[PDB]
Design a protein around this nucleic acid. Structure first.
Ligand code: TTP
Ligand code: MN
Ligand code: NA
Ligand code: NA
Length: 327
DNA sequence: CATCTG
DNA sequence: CAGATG
């Protein structure tokens, strides 16, 4: 956790570069398991050879470790941080909608900066365009003091649309969190579940209301169950407007709300543990259900859930406030 | 995983 | 449809 930090760090830099700049998925993946296992390792790696002893640890990585340990740097690592092409790709990628793949093509055509992109706004698709337009807004975190206003917003509209809606703002917001990065709304309705063959309106009618009132500003992606978009809190009495915030709405069959709700509420760490325990208690949990584990090796059969309560219970645990859902 | 693109 | 993004 700090005993082999630098090693796991340079390791991740190296790994990440493989995938992003080069295409070395294998290589990339290599650096990863490596950084993974050295992270667990209980000692203070004093040498290459020592590391090597580890699985996932080959001759090449060991080489790297050695040089790093020996000299506070790494040449390859140094050379990579200089390289324009590499830095360019790391940057482009910052734009929502731009992935490494596209990051390469742009750079190859010479688009390396923001200006570059504006100049060639023609080459970008919608998401990408939006991504570019709200570059800055996009990177700003979200003060919960804002979140509450928004949550307040969304909730009132869904309500006015159909009283049977059930909306939940999951995320860190849900877990206390002073600020968040984006707004996750989980949605369900009684009229929608496992078997119930579809109902798009379900999602589209609200999306619509939200835009209606001008909360939703753009659309990144709009499928029949998940909607990716842009939104913003009405600027009061013009002098101080709000940054555009990224939002995500998503349909959930009533019979699988709380699992996802639970789930999405994170944090990863809270999840797994809850997950590992579910296991002991003779169960299973994933993003939509909690099944009773048979013994034959495994089994199934979606247990019925009416609240986040029903799930803890199940695993015979202490119902945890969302706030404390920490780790 | 679900959606967009081309 | 394969392949990209989030
Ligand atoms: C899991 C991790 C999160 O709890 C959730 C997925 O939502 P994300 O938006 O990926 O994460 P988040 O809500 O934790 O982050 P943010 O600070 O951006 O709001 O499921
Ligand atoms: Mn979020
Ligand atoms: Na991006
Ligand atoms: Na292939």
């Amino acid at each position: 956790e700090t005993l082999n930090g630098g090693i796991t760090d340079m390791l991740t830099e190296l790994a990440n570069f493989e995938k992003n700049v080069s295409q070395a998925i294998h290589k990339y993946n290599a650096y990863r398991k490596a950084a993974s296992v050295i992270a667990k390792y209980p000692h203070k790696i004093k040498s290459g050879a020592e590391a090597k002893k580890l699985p996932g640890v080959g001759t090449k990585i060991a080489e790297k470790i050695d040089e790093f340990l020996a000299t506070g740097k790494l040449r390859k690592l140094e050379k990579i941080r200089q390289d324009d092409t590499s830095s360019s790709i790391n940057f482009l990628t910052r734009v929502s909608g731009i992935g490494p793949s596209a990051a390469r093509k742009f750079v190859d055509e010479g688009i390396k900066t923001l200006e570059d992109l504006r100049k060639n706004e023609d080459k970008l698709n919608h998401h990408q365009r939006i991504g570019l337009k709200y570059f800055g807004d996009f990177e700003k975190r979200i003060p919960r003091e804002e979140m509450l206003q928004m949550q307040d917003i969304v909730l009132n509209e869904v309500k006015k649309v159909d009283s049977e809606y059930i909306a939940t703002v999951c995320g860190s917001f849900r877990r206390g969190a002073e600020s968040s990065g984006d707004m996750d709304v989980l949605l369900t309705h009684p009229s929608f579940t496992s078997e119930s063959t579809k109902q798009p309106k379900l999602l589209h009618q609200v999306v619509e209301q939200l835009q209606k009132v001008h909360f939703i500003t753009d659309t990144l992606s709009k499928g029949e169950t998940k909607f990716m978009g842009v939104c913003q809190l009405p600027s009061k009495n013009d002098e101080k407007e709000y940054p555009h915030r990224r939002i995500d709405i998503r349909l959930i069959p009533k019979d699988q709300y709380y699992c996802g709700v639970l789930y999405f509420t994170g944090s990863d760490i809270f999840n797994k543990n809850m997950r590992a325990h579910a296991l002991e208690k003779g169960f299973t949990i994933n993003e939509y259900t909690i099944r009773p584990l048979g013994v034959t090796g495994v089994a199934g059969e979606p247990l019925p859930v009416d609240s986040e309560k029903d799930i803890f219970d199940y695993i015979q645990w202490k119902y945890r406030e969302p706030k404390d859902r920490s780790e």
